[PDB]
Amino acid sequence: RDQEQYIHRKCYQEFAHCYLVKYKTPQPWPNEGLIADQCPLPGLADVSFYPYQAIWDYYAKIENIRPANWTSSKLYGKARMGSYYIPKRLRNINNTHILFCSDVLYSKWYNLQNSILQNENELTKRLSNLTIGNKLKNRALPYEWAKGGLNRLFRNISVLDVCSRPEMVLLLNKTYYTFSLWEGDCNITRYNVNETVPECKDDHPYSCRLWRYREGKEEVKCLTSDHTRCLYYPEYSNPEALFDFGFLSYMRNFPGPQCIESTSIRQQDYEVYSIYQECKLASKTYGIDSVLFSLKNFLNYTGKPVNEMPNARAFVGLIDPKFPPTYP
Ligand SMILES: *[C@@H]1O[C@H](CO)[C@@H](O[C@@H]2O[C@H](CO)[C@@H](O[C@@H]3O[C@H](CO[C@H]4O[C@H](CO)[C@@H](O)[C@H](O[C@H]5O[C@H](CO)[C@@H](O)[C@H](O)[C@@H]5O)[C@@H]4O)[C@@H](O)[C@H](O[C@H]4O[C@H](CO)[C@@H](O)[C@H](O)[C@@H]4O[C@H]4O[C@H](CO)[C@@H](O)[C@H](O)[C@@H]4O[C@H]4O[C@H](CO)[C@@H](O)[C@H](O)[C@@H]4O)[C@@H]3O)[C@H](O)[C@H]2NC(C)=O)[C@H](O)[C@H]1NC(C)=O
Ligand SMILES: *[C@@H]1O[C@H](CO)[C@@H](O[C@@H]2O[C@H](CO)[C@@H](O[C@@H]3O[C@H](CO)[C@@H](O)[C@H](O)[C@@H]3O)[C@H](O)[C@H]2NC(C)=O)[C@H](O)[C@H]1NC(C)=O
Ligand SMILES: *[C@@H]1O[C@H](CO)[C@@H](O)[C@H](O)[C@H]1NC(C)=O
Ligand SMILES: *[C@@H]1O[C@H](CO)[C@@H](O)[C@H](O)[C@H]1NC(C)=O
Ligand SMILES: *[C@@H]1O[C@H](CO)[C@@H](O)[C@H](O)[C@H]1NC(C)=O
Ligand SMILES: *[C@@H]1O[C@H](CO)[C@@H](O)[C@H](O)[C@H]1NC(C)=O
Ligand SMILES: *[C@@H]1O[C@H](CO)[C@@H](O)[C@H](O)[C@H]1NC(C)=O
């Protein structure tokens, strides 16, 4: 009780929301380009109309002026300009586990409106119940992550999660679903929306319309003698420079087109370990000081501590880590 509540205090304040997901088979995010129209773009103005979207870190921004032989494949690989480039580091076939310290994935029983007393009580009570040792029972997870999943600990990831927790989605999503208003996708063109979209057959200005239109080939045209400052012509245009068209289409403000295609990324059940539960159990055998020291170094497996990262972004890949760690 005295040493149990002391171990709980230390284990909770440090590792309450820290978990280790093991992929059945190491499977990285399969594409270099991400189509996520549900997220608003940064916009041309100095001050954006939307608060910073973490996904903007991966934005393949179109610049109107580029050197004579500039192509998008130099910085953004196969990604479409105007959408997102997923860097090498977030699609590493060597990563076998996903370490994260975050409370953004809890289901409805956890929320800020509740006092910290209620949240802490309910989380430790669910962690005890939903674990065999330090391993979470399948019922704690979403069904998509593991068969028999009932969201008793973690909620399902949603369409907007990638806008604010991009690494969580790239690393944990079992399926990639596009959200697209790009002309050509799902065979929807500016000419056939009156046939592909049932709710349309001709109100909000954005009704029955695509966002980005198919222009043609990507090219750099040098009109003047300056060969370091030529006219860039992208494959697609944003004709009215709209930055939240897709976000408003998602938030169901009006009728019109939407293209949602799925790509299976990870197959087979995840294994999830609770680092608070591991802390609580290993401290009875090795002592709180060595368990706290060891689990802290485990959170620094990459050189940057995961518990010191912002909650929305504290999702990192590890290569064949030894868990539980060696306790001195
Ligand atoms: C990371 O992981 C996250 C977790 O998995 C993931 O989140 C999930 O994201 C997906 C993708 O956005 C979400 O699913 C979609 O939900 C759409 C909305 O559904 C509601 O509205 C519909 C419209 O009225 C209802 O039908 C629908 O009811 C159904 O679902 C209920 C549960 O939600 C269920 O209880 C009901 O019984 C019922 O079955 C619900 O109320 C939905 O519209 C969408 O469906 C399309 O896309 C699917 C995937 O490709 C297709 O399988 C499906 O058939 C639909 O495709 C059609 O429509 C598209 C346009 O919307 C077209 O592009 C397609 O080509 C296709 O169109 C053809 O067929 C039409 C008729 O079927 C026809 O009219 C057309 O002409 C054409 O022939 C899909 O289910 C999911 O809900 C999210 N999960 C959670 C928990 O939030 C996240 O996205 C991932 N992130 C990243 C970055 O990858
Ligand atoms: C999280 O995602 C899972 C899917 O992976 C959701 O579970 C599924 O939810 C649907 C809609 O409620 C269930 O469909 C219903 O099934 C009953 C019969 O079981 C049927 O009578 C209804 O007509 C309807 O089709 C589906 O059973 C269920 N699937 C599984 C495997 O559980 C879940 O609801 C999402 N969680 C939350 C909290 O949003
Ligand atoms: C651009 O490409 C052409 C064709 O390969 C080449 O001849 C030319 O020197 C390049 N321009 C510059 C400014 O390097
Ligand atoms: C994966 O590990 C192997 C062996 O150490 C290495 O050759 C390869 O470059 C690594 N891949 C990435 C994407 O770092
Ligand atoms: C977990 O909680 C449920 C709900 O009270 C209960 O039925 C179940 O027996 C509990 N499991 C354990 C390990 O006590
Ligand atoms: C788009 O058209 C091609 C045939 O030209 C077809 O194979 C493909 O499945 C269509 N896609 C959709 C989503 O309708
Ligand atoms: C994480 O490890 C690196 C060595 O790779 C070290 O420089 C850094 O101080 C460690 N962080 C902590 C909190 O000890």
Residue numbers in the entry: 218 to 419, 427 to 552
Paper text:
Recombinant RBDs from several simian FV (SFV) strains were tested for production in Drosophila S2 insect cells, and only the RBD from gorilla SFV (strain SFVggo_huBAK7422, genotype II; abbreviated as ‘GII’ herein) was expressed in high enough yields and formed crystals. To increase the chances of generating well-diffracting crystals, a fraction of the purified protein was enzymatically deglycosylated (RBDD) with endoglycosidases H and D, as described in the Methods section. Crystals were obtained for the RBDD, as well as for the untreated protein (RBDG). The RBDD diffracted better (2.57 Å) than RBDG (2.80 Å) and the structural analyses presented below were carried out using the RBDD structure, unless otherwise noted. The upper subdomain forms a wider (~45 Å diameter) and the N- and C-termini a narrow lobe (~20 Å diameter), which is also termed lower subdomain. The lower subdomain is comprised of a three-helix bundle (α1, α7, α8) that packs against an antiparallel, twisted four-stranded β-sheet (β14-β1-β5-β15) and against helix α2 (residues 333-346) that lays perpendicularly on the side of the bundle. The upper subdomain is formed by two long excursions out of the lower subdomain: ~70 residues connecting strands β1 and β5, and ~130 residues connecting η4 and β14. The N390 side chain and the first two attached NAG residues are buried in the RBD, rendering the EndoH/D cleavage site inaccessible, which allowed building 10 sugar residues in RBDG and 8 in the deglycosylated protein crystals. The N8 glycan emerges from a cavity that has N390 at its base and extends upwards, remaining in contact with the protein and preserving the same conformation in both crystal forms. The 7 N-linked glycans that we could resolve in the RBDD structure are all fully solvent-exposed, and additional density was observed in the PFV EM map for the sugars attached to N5, N6, N7, N8, N9 and N11, validating the RBD placements (the N7’ site is absent from PFV Env, and no extra density was observed at this site).
The FV envelope (Env) glycoprotein belongs to a class I fusogens, which are synthesized as single-chain precursors that fold into trimers, and whose protomers are subsequently cleaved in the Golgi compartment during transport to the cell surface. FV Env is cleaved at two sites by cellular furin during maturation, giving rise to 3 fragments: the leader peptide (LP), the surface (SU) subunit, which includes the receptor-binding domain (RBD), and the transmembrane subunit (TM), which harbors the fusion machinery. In this manuscript we present the X-ray structure of the RBD from a zoonotic gorilla FV at 2.57 Å resolution, which reveals a novel fold. We identified, within the RBD, two subdomains in terms of their structure, conservation, and function: the upper subdomain, which encompasses most of the genotype-specific region, and a more conserved, lower subdomain, important for binding to the attachment factor HS.
